């Protein structure tokens, strides 16, 4: 039996409208807080929009779930640094998120303000040029964007989100107290062979794409080492079935329902359960300057079955590890 | 306008039962002959079974289509060399096919007989061990299986089927008159980015898996060079939709309907239309010791539209390039 401080999810997608209403409870039932990514359509780029989104999230949180969404701002070339800093000072924005659609060299005033106020920058670290092989895009981001940025803004706190490579694992392990990373359950559990051998498995397709085994092993080693600037972020990224099992399936695993148990299994596999609690419930709060939760949950060794699908308004949501049997249940 | 000798398809899957009935006409309408792979359930491992399968194929060939299936034997550890040689001498088996499920070291008497009678060996050249990354399996086959085999049986004719790597392209370009290869349209047209960037595309999933761009370029260069021991083989490998767009999609592109036009486009792209006819209609017959066809077709520059699906008994067959617009039409 595993007793841990209630965890938090440092990287989550809740979407919006009815999907939001469906997926929130799976997070709010387990985690005390989550970093709520801003990539809606349209994205959350203003305080008012984040206020509104947070209330839509709260409206959707079941009664008796003690859950706080930590909001983020989608960095754009038009964002006024003053808007960002106001959201940060007012407790609206916990962090700001940089996606490849936005160029660092276009938003230097915003980044400089984040540095000055101590707001963390969350990075989806890929260079997305068509002439870069998909498996190389994360490595390429390190040398071409991440390092020069961190050299220019030396006080800036950066979370390298959902790292998937030895390149990134080494970079993070070897960097300073201002650099951290999150790791999903899928990038610990699997490598590209799992996605592509004996069939193509769209429910294991996500970005950054699963990499070769050597990379999975590097990630597993980093968590299992006790390194305390890596922490739980699921990157739970739900899409409807017709949208994962199609001629052009979307990237993202709906893993909120199973993630915690999956990380427990990985830590057990690596003979590193002593580091499981810090990963889920300590290392994140430490990097972000927030308190650790003071309620507790337990994982008990108990065969569960994962739902084959979950309903939405129309068609279905096919969870990560759908139909499969997992090892831990949340008490 | 392109006028060519009627082509042949040196690598095809026709399946069986109703699927056979649906897919044959798309081949028989265009090609004079095809190498019909033996991987049925159960596989074609006896003359009697190949006789029967060939008649099931012929039963399904529309009236006025001048099409001859060239049958192959699925090599197994239990196959009597005498059965094989009888099929070859009687015109039943044109060639025998080695899949990774069968080990070379188990069938040395059979291979030795093929060498002696001059029967070509067709190889699906991958090592399928779980501890070998999917992208490395073809390269690994060259050093661990192909080279030692060709060193042991120096008179043996071998077609390295559906080659997908520079490793294989170089190996074949640099080998002797007893070594040849086939190349699919998809491995010329695309690289792994096409399968995995901006979405996962199960209809581009096939074995051997699409490789990095450097490999696609090597293949394109080999065909465009005029090297005359590469030839058309589509590896048309149909599956039903529910089986390509599922939680675990099958490997194989149903490309019979579009392949010829797709190769024409590739050769035009590479400023190598002078080599297009030999590829489709000369180089194969030459390697196999068979006559070239003496009827002709034409490809005319004409926007066609590819069917979104094709019906079967139940559910549908989603062709390669389904719904898309292609450049050539067969006159
Ligand atoms: Zn991301
Ligand atoms: Zn994300
Ligand atoms: Zn094959
Ligand atoms: Zn094949």
Swiss-Prot record, chains A, B:
Pathway: Pyrimidine metabolism; UMP biosynthesis via de novo pathway; (S)-dihydroorotate from bicarbonate: step 3/3. Zn(2+) 1 binds at residues 11, 13, 97, 235. One of its GO terms (cellular component) is cytoplasm. Changing residue 239 to N: Lack of activity. Keywords: Hydrolase, Metal-binding, Pyrimidine biosynthesis, Zinc. Substrate binds at residues 13-15, 39, 124, 207, 239, 251. The modification N6-carboxylysine is found at residue 97. Its cofactor is Zn(2+). The active site is at 235. This is Dihydroorotase.
